[PDB]
Amino acid sequence: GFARLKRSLLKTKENLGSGFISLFRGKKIDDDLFEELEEQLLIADVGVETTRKIITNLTEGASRKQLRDAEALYGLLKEEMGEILAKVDEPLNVEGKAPFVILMVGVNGVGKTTTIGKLARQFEQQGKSVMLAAGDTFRAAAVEQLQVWGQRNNIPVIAQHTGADSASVIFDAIQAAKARNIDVLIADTAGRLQNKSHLMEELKKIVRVMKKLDVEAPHEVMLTIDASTGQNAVSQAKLFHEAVGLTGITLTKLDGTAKGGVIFSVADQFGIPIRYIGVGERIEDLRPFKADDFIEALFA
Amino acid sequence: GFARLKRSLLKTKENLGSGFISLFRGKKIDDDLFEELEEQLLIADVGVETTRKIITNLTEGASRKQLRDAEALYGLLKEEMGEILAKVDEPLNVEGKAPFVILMVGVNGVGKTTTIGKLARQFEQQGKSVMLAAGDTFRAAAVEQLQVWGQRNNIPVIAQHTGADSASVIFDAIQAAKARNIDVLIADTAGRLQNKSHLMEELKKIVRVMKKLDVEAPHEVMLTIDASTGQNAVSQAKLFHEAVGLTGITLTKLDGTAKGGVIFSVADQFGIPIRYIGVGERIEDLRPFKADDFIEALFA
Ligand SMILES: COc1cc(Br)c(OC)cc1N
Ligand SMILES: COc1cc(Br)c(OC)cc1N
Ligand SMILES: COc1cc(Br)c(OC)cc1N
Ligand SMILES: COc1cc(Br)c(OC)cc1N
Ligand SMILES: [N+]
Ligand SMILES: [N+]
Ligand SMILES: [N+]
Ligand SMILES: [N+]
Ligand SMILES: [N+]
Ligand SMILES: [N+]
Ligand SMILES: [N+]
Ligand SMILES: [N+]
Ligand SMILES: [N+]
Ligand SMILES: [N+]
Ligand SMILES: [N+]
Ligand SMILES: [N+]
Ligand SMILES: [N+]
Ligand SMILES: [N+]
Ligand SMILES: [N+]
Ligand SMILES: [N+]
Ligand SMILES: [N+]
């Protein structure tokens, strides 16, 4: 089963899941084996600390039950790693708000705006009215692209002049969304990395200005990260988390990359729900994260 | 490809998958709507019990998620029905046997022999050696047809005189297949409906004689049914599963029919893996069943 998901994770299945099989066949459970396993986990971008946790738990349980063959570790791994993803398997519920406000954060070039469009189309297909806020105010090309997309897809896009104050754009966007009975407002933000502090202060200002119109907003702080950036995805995650406090994560480009294992780091180091995973070019390829499906396709 | 699949499933998409869209547009989630949906599912030959399961799960999920608009039901349906197919998405692996024995069961006039030829051609295209056994010994026309096909395609066909013992023909075919290093042996059988008892007992005899040469044979018991026969396809399945013990199902003629929903019944009532679906006249149109691809082409 899960043919399409397996196809997305093939390069990730090189090292994780079924990739363990060739590593365990006809081996004895000893320090050599745990070393090779640690190495294969690190290669998959699982991270030093997360790999340390997995190797430690596996070693202690194995030695306690004195498993004889290395093949028997496979199942244990499937459990351990599975548990990790299970702790971030909370889908996003955007119902019952006028509007439900999603603040989209992350650097540029990781599929953030693509995620905005896909989520917009999904929400509209679910019978909801969507509005966008072009809060990336200093990149005229990005804003105009978002506006042309809105015009082609009949979704309103709030924008201001190049160089406008993002918090003002998003403020006006919330006002217009409440006035027009919008169900979901998705607010884009600047994704420049240069000047970490400034971008952080800018996001905090956007939030504080949000609280003038609705203290519950933003209802979702969604970070977008790219799996094919390996451990960079981890750093970025921490960067934004310290500054605004994330509530959801979208992990894109899981297909066509061997760095998929980064998910286990992201899930383990932060425990923030992974709302969606991007496993293809289609709108439906931005899928709600289901930990069990992911594990089964990985370890098959 | 995917596009050709969607086009093949257009006539079934009238009522199922995307066919739900017009039914949910601008409607309120109430008993009237669930009644219209239940009716549309039954008309599509989804089956009474399976339709009840879908309607119940959909309703409970709706109330649990406090969905407002009927459009939002679409996704849940796509999941529900998808789950049904996901539980029978184990593809057929015919590797590593000398030969892998496929016992082809089913009635006549449902594409059984056509499926035999297509599977033979595919396996041969994959680099495997194929042999056929004309176990439908009492229909001289069928045997002669299978033989002329095998000679036209240079594939050996084991046969005996009209009225020979099918179990003997298949016995000789397994012996010769083991002797010639054949990878896959496909054995046809009688598909007469009159007097089930005779045919069923005949299949148990064929199996018992098979196990004299290879206790693992038959490695696959493949039922062939015709989707365009609606609930007849269900009955036949019930007939054969109780009688011989199936391990795979091929559903032919999914193109050009509005009764495609029968697949969801077959998957739900029996839980036997659906190995292939026939969506066209070409050799490649007998596709290995991928539940996710099928769902995506049906919906959206
Ligand atoms: C070209 O297609 C898009 C353009 C933009 Br801009 C986007 O962000 C809303 C999403 C998509 N899919
Ligand atoms: C100048 O960026 C802002 C825009 C609005 Br609107 C606001 O709320 C009055 C506060 C700030 N800082
Ligand atoms: C390739 O599937 C076939 C198998 C037989 Br046997 C046949 O009889 C001539 C026709 C077809 N298409
Ligand atoms: C008459 O059907 C059979 C054919 C063979 Br061959 C066999 O092996 C001795 C047993 C039986 N019953
Ligand atoms: N051990
Ligand atoms: N809001
Ligand atoms: N990011
Ligand atoms: N991007
Ligand atoms: N619009
Ligand atoms: N605007
Ligand atoms: N803007
Ligand atoms: N407003
Ligand atoms: N990233
Ligand atoms: N195609
Ligand atoms: N609608
Ligand atoms: N069959
Ligand atoms: N049969
Ligand atoms: N071929
Ligand atoms: N036959
Ligand atoms: N016979
Ligand atoms: N014989």
Side-chain angles (χ1 to χ4, degrees), chain B residues 182-238:
Chain B
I182 294 294
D183 291 307
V184 183
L185 173 66
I186 306 177
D188 192 8
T189 66
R192 304 179 309 274
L193 284 151
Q194 297 274 318
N195 300 315
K196 97 173 178 182
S197 52
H198 295 7
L199 179 60
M200 300 315 94
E201 190 180 38
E202 173 178 7
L203 301 178
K204 289 180 180 173
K205 178 170 77 169
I206 292 168
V207 172
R208 284 186 294 93
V209 176
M210 276 191 173
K211 304 202 168 294
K212 291 179 178 172
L213 301 173
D214 187 341
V215 299
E216 294 177 337
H219 300 80
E220 174 77 338
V221 184
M222 177 93 70
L223 168 74
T224 296
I225 44 175
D226 186 333
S228 73
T229 65
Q231 294 290 280
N232 286 335
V234 176
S235 293
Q236 296 168 15
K238 189 187 181 203

Short mmCIF file of all heavy atoms in Angstrom, two decimals, chain B residues 182-238:
data_model
loop_
_atom_site.label_atom_id
_atom_site.label_comp_id
_atom_site.label_asym_id
_atom_site.label_seq_id
_atom_site.Cartn_x
_atom_site.Cartn_y
_atom_site.Cartn_z
N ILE B 182 10.63 -22.49 -15.19
CA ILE B 182 9.63 -21.46 -15.41
C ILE B 182 9.44 -20.64 -14.14
O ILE B 182 9.39 -21.19 -13.03
CB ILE B 182 8.30 -22.07 -15.90
CG1 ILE B 182 8.48 -22.71 -17.28
CG2 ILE B 182 7.19 -21.01 -15.93
CD1 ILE B 182 8.80 -21.74 -18.41
N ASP B 183 9.33 -19.32 -14.30
CA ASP B 183 9.17 -18.43 -13.16
C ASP B 183 7.72 -18.36 -12.69
O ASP B 183 7.45 -18.39 -11.49
CB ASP B 183 9.68 -17.04 -13.51
CG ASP B 183 11.18 -16.98 -13.68
OD1 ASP B 183 11.90 -17.42 -12.76
OD2 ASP B 183 11.64 -16.51 -14.74
N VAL B 184 6.77 -18.27 -13.63
CA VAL B 184 5.36 -18.09 -13.30
C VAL B 184 4.54 -19.07 -14.13
O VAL B 184 4.69 -19.14 -15.35
CB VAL B 184 4.89 -16.64 -13.55
CG1 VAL B 184 3.44 -16.47 -13.12
CG2 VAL B 184 5.79 -15.66 -12.82
N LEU B 185 3.67 -19.81 -13.45
CA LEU B 185 2.69 -20.69 -14.08
C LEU B 185 1.29 -20.15 -13.77
O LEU B 185 0.93 -20.01 -12.60
CB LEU B 185 2.83 -22.12 -13.57
CG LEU B 185 1.76 -23.11 -14.04
CD1 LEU B 185 1.84 -23.32 -15.55
CD2 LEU B 185 1.88 -24.42 -13.30
N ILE B 186 0.53 -19.86 -14.82
CA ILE B 186 -0.85 -19.38 -14.68
C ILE B 186 -1.77 -20.51 -15.14
O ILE B 186 -1.70 -20.95 -16.29
CB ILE B 186 -1.09 -18.10 -15.49
CG1 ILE B 186 -0.07 -17.03 -15.10
CG2 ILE B 186 -2.51 -17.60 -15.26
CD1 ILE B 186 -0.17 -15.74 -15.90
N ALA B 187 -2.63 -20.97 -14.23
CA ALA B 187 -3.51 -22.10 -14.48
C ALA B 187 -4.95 -21.62 -14.59
O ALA B 187 -5.51 -21.11 -13.62
CB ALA B 187 -3.37 -23.14 -13.37
N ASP B 188 -5.54 -21.80 -15.77
CA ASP B 188 -6.96 -21.55 -15.96
C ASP B 188 -7.79 -22.69 -15.38
O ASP B 188 -7.31 -23.82 -15.23
CB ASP B 188 -7.27 -21.37 -17.45
CG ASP B 188 -8.66 -20.82 -17.69
OD1 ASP B 188 -9.33 -20.43 -16.71
OD2 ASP B 188 -9.08 -20.77 -18.87
N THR B 189 -9.04 -22.40 -15.05
CA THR B 189 -9.94 -23.40 -14.49
C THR B 189 -11.34 -23.19 -15.05
O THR B 189 -11.64 -22.19 -15.70
CB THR B 189 -9.97 -23.33 -12.95
OG1 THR B 189 -10.55 -22.09 -12.53
CG2 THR B 189 -8.57 -23.45 -12.37
N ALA B 190 -12.21 -24.17 -14.78
CA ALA B 190 -13.58 -24.13 -15.27
C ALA B 190 -14.37 -23.03 -14.57
O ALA B 190 -14.25 -22.83 -13.36
CB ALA B 190 -14.26 -25.48 -15.05
N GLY B 191 -15.20 -22.32 -15.34
CA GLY B 191 -15.99 -21.22 -14.82
C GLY B 191 -17.49 -21.41 -14.94
O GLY B 191 -18.24 -20.44 -14.97
N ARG B 192 -17.94 -22.67 -15.01
CA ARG B 192 -19.36 -22.96 -15.08
C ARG B 192 -20.04 -22.62 -13.76
O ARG B 192 -19.50 -22.87 -12.68
CB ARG B 192 -19.59 -24.43 -15.38
CG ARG B 192 -18.94 -24.97 -16.63
CD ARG B 192 -19.26 -26.45 -16.75
NE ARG B 192 -18.94 -27.16 -15.51
CZ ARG B 192 -17.75 -27.64 -15.19
NH1 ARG B 192 -16.72 -27.53 -16.02
NH2 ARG B 192 -17.58 -28.26 -14.03
N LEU B 193 -21.24 -22.05 -13.85
CA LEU B 193 -21.99 -21.69 -12.64
C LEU B 193 -22.94 -22.80 -12.20
O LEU B 193 -23.11 -23.02 -11.00
CB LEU B 193 -22.76 -20.40 -12.87
CG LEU B 193 -21.90 -19.13 -12.84
CD1 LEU B 193 -22.50 -18.05 -13.71
CD2 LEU B 193 -21.74 -18.65 -11.40
N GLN B 194 -23.58 -23.49 -13.15
CA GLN B 194 -24.51 -24.56 -12.81
C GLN B 194 -23.86 -25.55 -11.86
O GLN B 194 -22.74 -26.00 -12.08
CB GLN B 194 -24.96 -25.28 -14.08
CG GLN B 194 -25.74 -24.43 -15.08
CD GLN B 194 -27.22 -24.40 -14.78
OE1 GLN B 194 -27.82 -25.42 -14.44
NE2 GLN B 194 -27.83 -23.23 -14.93
N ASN B 195 -24.59 -25.90 -10.79
CA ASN B 195 -24.07 -26.84 -9.80
C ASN B 195 -22.73 -26.37 -9.25
O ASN B 195 -21.68 -26.87 -9.68
CB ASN B 195 -23.94 -28.23 -10.43
CG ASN B 195 -25.27 -28.77 -10.93
OD1 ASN B 195 -26.29 -28.68 -10.24
ND2 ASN B 195 -25.28 -29.30 -12.15
N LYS B 196 -22.74 -25.42 -8.31
CA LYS B 196 -21.47 -24.94 -7.76
C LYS B 196 -20.68 -26.09 -7.17
O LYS B 196 -19.46 -26.17 -7.36
CB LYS B 196 -21.69 -23.86 -6.69
CG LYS B 196 -21.67 -24.37 -5.23
CD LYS B 196 -21.71 -23.22 -4.24
CE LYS B 196 -21.74 -23.74 -2.81
NZ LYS B 196 -21.83 -22.63 -1.81
N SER B 197 -21.35 -26.98 -6.44
CA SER B 197 -20.67 -28.01 -5.66
C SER B 197 -19.62 -28.73 -6.50
O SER B 197 -18.48 -28.93 -6.06
CB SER B 197 -21.69 -29.01 -5.12
OG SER B 197 -22.52 -29.50 -6.16
N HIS B 198 -19.99 -29.11 -7.72
CA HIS B 198 -19.05 -29.82 -8.58
C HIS B 198 -17.79 -29.01 -8.81
O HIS B 198 -16.67 -29.49 -8.61
CB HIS B 198 -19.73 -30.14 -9.92
CG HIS B 198 -20.88 -31.09 -9.80
ND1 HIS B 198 -21.38 -31.51 -8.59
CD2 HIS B 198 -21.64 -31.69 -10.75
CE1 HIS B 198 -22.39 -32.34 -8.80
NE2 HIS B 198 -22.57 -32.46 -10.10
N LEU B 199 -17.95 -27.75 -9.23
CA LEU B 199 -16.80 -26.90 -9.52
C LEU B 199 -15.96 -26.64 -8.27
O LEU B 199 -14.72 -26.69 -8.33
CB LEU B 199 -17.26 -25.58 -10.14
CG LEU B 199 -16.17 -24.56 -10.48
CD1 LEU B 199 -15.20 -25.14 -11.49
CD2 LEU B 199 -16.80 -23.29 -11.02
N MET B 200 -16.60 -26.35 -7.14
CA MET B 200 -15.85 -26.07 -5.92
C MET B 200 -15.03 -27.29 -5.49
O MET B 200 -13.81 -27.20 -5.30
CB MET B 200 -16.81 -25.65 -4.80
CG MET B 200 -17.63 -24.38 -5.09
SD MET B 200 -16.74 -22.98 -5.81
CE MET B 200 -17.02 -23.21 -7.56
N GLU B 201 -15.70 -28.44 -5.34
CA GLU B 201 -14.99 -29.68 -5.05
C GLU B 201 -13.86 -29.89 -6.04
O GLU B 201 -12.78 -30.39 -5.68
CB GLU B 201 -15.98 -30.85 -5.08
CG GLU B 201 -15.42 -32.16 -4.56
CD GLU B 201 -16.44 -33.28 -4.62
OE1 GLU B 201 -17.21 -33.34 -5.61
OE2 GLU B 201 -16.48 -34.11 -3.69
N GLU B 202 -14.09 -29.52 -7.30
CA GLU B 202 -13.06 -29.64 -8.33
C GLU B 202 -11.86 -28.76 -8.00
O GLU B 202 -10.71 -29.18 -8.21
CB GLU B 202 -13.65 -29.29 -9.69
CG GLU B 202 -12.66 -29.22 -10.83
CD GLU B 202 -13.33 -28.92 -12.16
OE1 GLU B 202 -14.55 -28.64 -12.16
OE2 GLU B 202 -12.64 -28.96 -13.20
N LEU B 203 -12.10 -27.55 -7.50
CA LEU B 203 -10.98 -26.68 -7.13
C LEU B 203 -10.20 -27.25 -5.95
O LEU B 203 -8.97 -27.24 -5.96
CB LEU B 203 -11.48 -25.27 -6.81
CG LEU B 203 -12.24 -24.53 -7.91
CD1 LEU B 203 -12.71 -23.18 -7.40
CD2 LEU B 203 -11.36 -24.36 -9.14
N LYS B 204 -10.90 -27.75 -4.93
CA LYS B 204 -10.19 -28.36 -3.81
C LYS B 204 -9.37 -29.55 -4.29
O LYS B 204 -8.25 -29.78 -3.81
CB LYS B 204 -11.17 -28.77 -2.72
CG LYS B 204 -11.77 -27.59 -1.97
CD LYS B 204 -12.74 -28.03 -0.88
CE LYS B 204 -13.32 -26.83 -0.16
NZ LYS B 204 -14.40 -27.19 0.80
N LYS B 205 -9.89 -30.31 -5.25
CA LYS B 205 -9.11 -31.40 -5.84
C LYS B 205 -7.87 -30.87 -6.55
O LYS B 205 -6.78 -31.42 -6.39
CB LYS B 205 -9.98 -32.20 -6.81
CG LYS B 205 -9.24 -33.34 -7.50
CD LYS B 205 -10.18 -34.26 -8.26
CE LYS B 205 -10.63 -33.63 -9.57
NZ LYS B 205 -11.35 -34.60 -10.44
N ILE B 206 -8.03 -29.80 -7.33
CA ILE B 206 -6.89 -29.21 -8.03
C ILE B 206 -5.81 -28.80 -7.04
O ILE B 206 -4.62 -29.00 -7.28
CB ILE B 206 -7.35 -28.03 -8.90
CG1 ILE B 206 -8.22 -28.53 -10.06
CG2 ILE B 206 -6.15 -27.26 -9.45
CD1 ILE B 206 -8.96 -27.44 -10.80
N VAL B 207 -6.21 -28.20 -5.91
CA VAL B 207 -5.22 -27.78 -4.92
C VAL B 207 -4.53 -28.99 -4.31
O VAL B 207 -3.30 -29.06 -4.23
CB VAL B 207 -5.89 -26.90 -3.85
CG1 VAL B 207 -4.93 -26.61 -2.70
CG2 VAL B 207 -6.38 -25.60 -4.46
N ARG B 208 -5.32 -29.98 -3.88
CA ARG B 208 -4.73 -31.17 -3.27
C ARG B 208 -3.74 -31.84 -4.20
O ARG B 208 -2.68 -32.31 -3.76
CB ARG B 208 -5.84 -32.15 -2.87
CG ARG B 208 -6.59 -31.75 -1.61
CD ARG B 208 -7.57 -32.81 -1.16
NE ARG B 208 -8.67 -33.01 -2.11
CZ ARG B 208 -8.68 -33.92 -3.09
NH1 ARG B 208 -7.65 -34.73 -3.27
NH2 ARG B 208 -9.73 -34.01 -3.89
N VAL B 209 -4.05 -31.90 -5.50
CA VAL B 209 -3.11 -32.48 -6.46
C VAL B 209 -1.91 -31.56 -6.66
O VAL B 209 -0.79 -32.03 -6.89
CB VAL B 209 -3.83 -32.78 -7.79
CG1 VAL B 209 -2.84 -33.28 -8.83
CG2 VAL B 209 -4.94 -33.79 -7.57
N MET B 210 -2.11 -30.24 -6.59
CA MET B 210 -0.99 -29.32 -6.69
C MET B 210 0.04 -29.58 -5.60
O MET B 210 1.25 -29.62 -5.86
CB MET B 210 -1.47 -27.87 -6.59
CG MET B 210 -1.97 -27.25 -7.87
SD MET B 210 -2.20 -25.48 -7.64
CE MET B 210 -2.56 -24.96 -9.31
N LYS B 211 -0.43 -29.76 -4.37
CA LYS B 211 0.48 -29.90 -3.24
C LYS B 211 1.29 -31.19 -3.27
O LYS B 211 2.19 -31.35 -2.44
CB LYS B 211 -0.30 -29.76 -1.93
CG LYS B 211 -1.07 -28.45 -1.88
CD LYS B 211 -1.42 -28.03 -0.46
CE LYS B 211 -1.93 -26.59 -0.44
NZ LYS B 211 -0.88 -25.60 -0.80
N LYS B 212 1.00 -32.11 -4.20
CA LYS B 212 1.85 -33.29 -4.34
C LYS B 212 3.22 -32.93 -4.90
O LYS B 212 4.22 -33.56 -4.54
CB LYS B 212 1.17 -34.32 -5.24
CG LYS B 212 -0.06 -34.97 -4.64
CD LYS B 212 -0.67 -35.96 -5.61
CE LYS B 212 -1.88 -36.65 -5.01
NZ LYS B 212 -2.60 -37.47 -6.02
N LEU B 213 3.28 -31.93 -5.78
CA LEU B 213 4.53 -31.49 -6.39
C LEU B 213 5.14 -30.30 -5.68
O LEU B 213 6.37 -30.16 -5.67
CB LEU B 213 4.31 -31.14 -7.86
CG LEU B 213 3.78 -32.28 -8.75
CD1 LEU B 213 3.44 -31.76 -10.13
CD2 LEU B 213 4.80 -33.41 -8.84
N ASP B 214 4.32 -29.43 -5.09
CA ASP B 214 4.82 -28.26 -4.37
C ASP B 214 3.78 -27.91 -3.31
O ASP B 214 2.68 -27.47 -3.65
CB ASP B 214 5.06 -27.09 -5.32
CG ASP B 214 5.74 -25.91 -4.64
OD1 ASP B 214 5.71 -25.84 -3.39
OD2 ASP B 214 6.30 -25.06 -5.36
N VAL B 215 4.14 -28.09 -2.04
CA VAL B 215 3.19 -27.85 -0.96
C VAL B 215 2.81 -26.38 -0.84
O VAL B 215 1.76 -26.06 -0.28
CB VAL B 215 3.76 -28.37 0.38
CG1 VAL B 215 4.02 -29.87 0.30
CG2 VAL B 215 5.03 -27.61 0.76
N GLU B 216 3.64 -25.47 -1.36
CA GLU B 216 3.31 -24.06 -1.35
C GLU B 216 2.32 -23.68 -2.45
O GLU B 216 1.70 -22.61 -2.37
CB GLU B 216 4.57 -23.21 -1.51
CG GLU B 216 5.54 -23.32 -0.34
CD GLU B 216 6.80 -22.52 -0.57
OE1 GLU B 216 7.14 -22.25 -1.74
OE2 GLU B 216 7.46 -22.15 0.42
N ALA B 217 2.16 -24.52 -3.47
CA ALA B 217 1.26 -24.19 -4.56
C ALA B 217 -0.18 -24.53 -4.18
O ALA B 217 -0.43 -25.52 -3.50
CB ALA B 217 1.65 -24.96 -5.82
N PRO B 218 -1.16 -23.71 -4.61
CA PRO B 218 -0.99 -22.48 -5.40
C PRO B 218 -0.48 -21.32 -4.56
O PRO B 218 -0.96 -21.11 -3.44
CB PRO B 218 -2.40 -22.20 -5.91
CG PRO B 218 -3.28 -22.75 -4.86
CD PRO B 218 -2.58 -23.98 -4.33
N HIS B 219 0.50 -20.57 -5.08
CA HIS B 219 1.02 -19.43 -4.34
C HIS B 219 0.04 -18.26 -4.35
O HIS B 219 0.03 -17.45 -3.42
CB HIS B 219 2.36 -18.99 -4.92
CG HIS B 219 3.41 -20.06 -4.87
ND1 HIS B 219 3.48 -21.08 -5.78
CD2 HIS B 219 4.45 -20.25 -4.01
CE1 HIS B 219 4.50 -21.86 -5.50
NE2 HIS B 219 5.11 -21.38 -4.43
N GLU B 220 -0.78 -18.15 -5.40
CA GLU B 220 -1.80 -17.11 -5.48
C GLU B 220 -3.09 -17.73 -6.00
O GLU B 220 -3.07 -18.40 -7.03
CB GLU B 220 -1.35 -15.97 -6.40
CG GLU B 220 -2.40 -14.89 -6.66
CD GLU B 220 -2.58 -13.95 -5.49
OE1 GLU B 220 -2.22 -14.32 -4.35
OE2 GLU B 220 -3.06 -12.82 -5.71
N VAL B 221 -4.19 -17.52 -5.29
CA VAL B 221 -5.52 -17.86 -5.78
C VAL B 221 -6.18 -16.56 -6.20
O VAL B 221 -6.56 -15.74 -5.35
CB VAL B 221 -6.34 -18.60 -4.72
CG1 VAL B 221 -7.69 -19.02 -5.30
CG2 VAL B 221 -5.59 -19.82 -4.20
N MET B 222 -6.32 -16.36 -7.51
CA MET B 222 -6.76 -15.10 -8.08
C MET B 222 -8.17 -15.26 -8.64
O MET B 222 -8.38 -16.00 -9.60
CB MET B 222 -5.80 -14.65 -9.18
CG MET B 222 -6.21 -13.37 -9.91
SD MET B 222 -5.49 -11.88 -9.19
CE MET B 222 -3.77 -12.09 -9.63
N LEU B 223 -9.13 -14.56 -8.04
CA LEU B 223 -10.48 -14.47 -8.59
C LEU B 223 -10.53 -13.35 -9.62
O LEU B 223 -9.95 -12.28 -9.40
CB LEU B 223 -11.50 -14.22 -7.49
CG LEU B 223 -12.92 -13.81 -7.92
CD1 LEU B 223 -13.68 -15.00 -8.47
CD2 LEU B 223 -13.67 -13.19 -6.75
N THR B 224 -11.22 -13.59 -10.73
CA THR B 224 -11.49 -12.54 -11.71
C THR B 224 -12.98 -12.24 -11.72
O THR B 224 -13.80 -13.15 -11.86
CB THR B 224 -11.02 -12.95 -13.11
OG1 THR B 224 -9.60 -13.11 -13.12
CG2 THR B 224 -11.41 -11.88 -14.14
N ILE B 225 -13.33 -10.96 -11.57
CA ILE B 225 -14.72 -10.54 -11.63
C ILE B 225 -14.83 -9.31 -12.53
O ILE B 225 -13.85 -8.61 -12.78
CB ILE B 225 -15.32 -10.24 -10.24
CG1 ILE B 225 -14.33 -9.43 -9.39
CG2 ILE B 225 -15.70 -11.54 -9.55
CD1 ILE B 225 -14.89 -8.98 -8.05
N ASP B 226 -16.04 -9.07 -13.01
CA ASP B 226 -16.32 -8.00 -13.96
C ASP B 226 -17.08 -6.89 -13.22
O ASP B 226 -18.15 -7.13 -12.67
CB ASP B 226 -17.14 -8.52 -15.14
CG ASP B 226 -17.34 -7.49 -16.23
OD1 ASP B 226 -17.33 -6.28 -15.93
OD2 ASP B 226 -17.51 -7.89 -17.40
N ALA B 227 -16.51 -5.69 -13.22
CA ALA B 227 -17.13 -4.58 -12.51
C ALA B 227 -18.48 -4.22 -13.12
O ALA B 227 -19.44 -3.92 -12.40
CB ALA B 227 -16.21 -3.36 -12.52
N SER B 228 -18.59 -4.28 -14.45
CA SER B 228 -19.82 -3.92 -15.13
C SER B 228 -20.97 -4.89 -14.85
O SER B 228 -22.07 -4.67 -15.37
CB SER B 228 -19.57 -3.84 -16.64
OG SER B 228 -19.42 -5.13 -17.20
N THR B 229 -20.74 -5.93 -14.06
CA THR B 229 -21.80 -6.83 -13.63
C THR B 229 -22.31 -6.49 -12.23
O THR B 229 -23.06 -7.28 -11.64
CB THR B 229 -21.32 -8.28 -13.67
OG1 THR B 229 -20.26 -8.47 -12.72
CG2 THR B 229 -20.81 -8.63 -15.07
N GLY B 230 -21.91 -5.35 -11.69
CA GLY B 230 -22.48 -4.88 -10.44
C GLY B 230 -22.41 -5.94 -9.36
O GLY B 230 -21.40 -6.62 -9.18
N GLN B 231 -23.53 -6.11 -8.65
CA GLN B 231 -23.54 -7.00 -7.49
C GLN B 231 -23.33 -8.45 -7.88
O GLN B 231 -23.00 -9.26 -7.00
CB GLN B 231 -24.85 -6.84 -6.72
CG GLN B 231 -25.02 -5.48 -6.08
CD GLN B 231 -24.07 -5.27 -4.91
OE1 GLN B 231 -24.32 -5.73 -3.80
NE2 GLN B 231 -22.97 -4.57 -5.16
N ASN B 232 -23.48 -8.82 -9.15
CA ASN B 232 -23.10 -10.17 -9.55
C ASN B 232 -21.64 -10.42 -9.20
O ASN B 232 -21.30 -11.46 -8.61
CB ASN B 232 -23.34 -10.39 -11.04
CG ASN B 232 -24.81 -10.53 -11.38
OD1 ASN B 232 -25.62 -10.92 -10.55
ND2 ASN B 232 -25.16 -10.21 -12.63
N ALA B 233 -20.77 -9.45 -9.50
CA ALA B 233 -19.37 -9.56 -9.13
C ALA B 233 -19.22 -9.85 -7.65
O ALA B 233 -18.33 -10.61 -7.24
CB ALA B 233 -18.63 -8.28 -9.51
N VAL B 234 -20.08 -9.26 -6.82
CA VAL B 234 -20.03 -9.54 -5.39
C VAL B 234 -20.40 -11.00 -5.14
O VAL B 234 -19.65 -11.74 -4.50
CB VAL B 234 -20.96 -8.58 -4.62
CG1 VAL B 234 -21.00 -8.94 -3.13
CG2 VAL B 234 -20.51 -7.14 -4.81
N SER B 235 -21.54 -11.43 -5.68
CA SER B 235 -22.00 -12.79 -5.43
C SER B 235 -20.92 -13.80 -5.81
O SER B 235 -20.51 -14.63 -4.99
CB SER B 235 -23.29 -13.06 -6.20
OG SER B 235 -24.36 -12.28 -5.69
N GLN B 236 -20.42 -13.71 -7.04
CA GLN B 236 -19.35 -14.59 -7.48
C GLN B 236 -18.22 -14.61 -6.45
O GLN B 236 -17.78 -15.68 -6.02
CB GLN B 236 -18.83 -14.14 -8.84
CG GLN B 236 -19.87 -14.24 -9.95
CD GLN B 236 -19.45 -13.53 -11.22
OE1 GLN B 236 -18.28 -13.19 -11.40
NE2 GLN B 236 -20.40 -13.30 -12.11
N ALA B 237 -17.77 -13.43 -6.01
CA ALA B 237 -16.71 -13.39 -5.02
C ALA B 237 -17.09 -14.21 -3.80
O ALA B 237 -16.39 -15.15 -3.42
CB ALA B 237 -16.40 -11.94 -4.64
N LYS B 238 -18.27 -13.92 -3.23
CA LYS B 238 -18.74 -14.67 -2.08
C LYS B 238 -18.74 -16.16 -2.40
O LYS B 238 -18.33 -16.99 -1.58
CB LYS B 238 -20.13 -14.19 -1.68
CG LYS B 238 -20.65 -14.75 -0.36
CD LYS B 238 -22.10 -14.35 -0.15
CE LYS B 238 -22.65 -14.87 1.16
NZ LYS B 238 -24.14 -14.96 1.13
#
